[PDB]
């Protein structure tokens, strides 16, 4: 967005009460490493977090 914090003072953000998606992650910037531990990226929109 504009700027993020360091790792020792890790930046925390709270998100709820909205719709999330993974296919919308490939428009504003192309990512390099994307690993969802234990969860396949194709099913994330099919579960309700």
């Amino acid at each position, epitope marked *: 967005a504009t700027r993020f914090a360091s790792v020792y003072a890790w930046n925390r953000k709270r998100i709820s009460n909205c719709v999330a998606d993974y296919s919308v992650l490939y*428009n504003s910037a192309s990512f390099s490493t994307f690993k969802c531990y234990g969860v396949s990226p194709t099913k994330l929109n099919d579960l309700c977090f």
Partner: antibody
Amino acid sequence: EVQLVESGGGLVQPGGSLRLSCAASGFTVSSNYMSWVRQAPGKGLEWVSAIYSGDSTYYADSVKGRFTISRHNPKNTLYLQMNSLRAEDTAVYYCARLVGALTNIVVSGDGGAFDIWGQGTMVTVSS
Amino acid sequence: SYELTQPASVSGSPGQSITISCTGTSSDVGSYNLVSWYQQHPGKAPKLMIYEVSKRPSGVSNRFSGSKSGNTASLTISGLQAEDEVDYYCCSYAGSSTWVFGGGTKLTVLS
């Protein structure tokens, strides 16, 4: 810094041509918005200039063969070689923005939000 | 040369609700959606206050709204103030990503 600035204003006579320009500052015109709204005070308006680059079939059936315009992305400025200027085109234009659907501003929706304009130039076609 | 019907003269008391419309045809009734309403103090570039008719502009006072049905319209301007004596328009589709809109409803605030 981010601003649309109109430039290249001069006198136009019947039978002549002139190269207008709308220069974006801050944001490069390669991946940004440009909408040329033509305003005459007191009455209705019209959006006319149909230049979205790639050079395919997209045009309005009112200015066929009159308004010719080119594209220059890296220089962050667009030039308007408005040829065959008619004397009944007394209006101050504005290059502006819009909104589509891709980025975080729209994930579900339509878009279409002109939000940043220019200041316009004063070009009169007089005999 | 392309121009659609709008109610030019509209007026309402402060704190009331007024309705603004702009005309289309039967080729615009099945299932599209593109309507964004304008705002102009006369003599300069417009201002955005309402778009995505029934949803949220980023920074805008939530006193204004819009409502959508059939041939029955509303740009619902509510909570009128002394600064609402401004020009208004809509937006609309014309088919195959083309565009058209209405003829400039002008609001005058009384009282």
